[PDB]
């Protein structure tokens, strides 16, 4: 239980959840 993902990391639709208002731009989580 760390976290989730941040604006640089790799994640994807259902691989790797990221915070909340970070969605997967192509493939590393944005800052919508």
């Given amino acids: ?3 989730c ?7 994807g639709p259902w691989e ?3 915070c ?3 969605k997967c731009d192509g493939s590393e ?3 919508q």
Wanted: hydrophobic share 35%; proline share 11%; with cysteine.
């Fill in 5 to 11: 993902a941040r604006v640089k990391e790799a994640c």
């Fill in 29 to 31: 989580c944005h800052p």
């Fill in 20 to 22: 909340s208002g970070l």
């Fill in 1 to 3: 239980w760390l976290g």
């Fill in 16 to 18: 790797w959840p990221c």
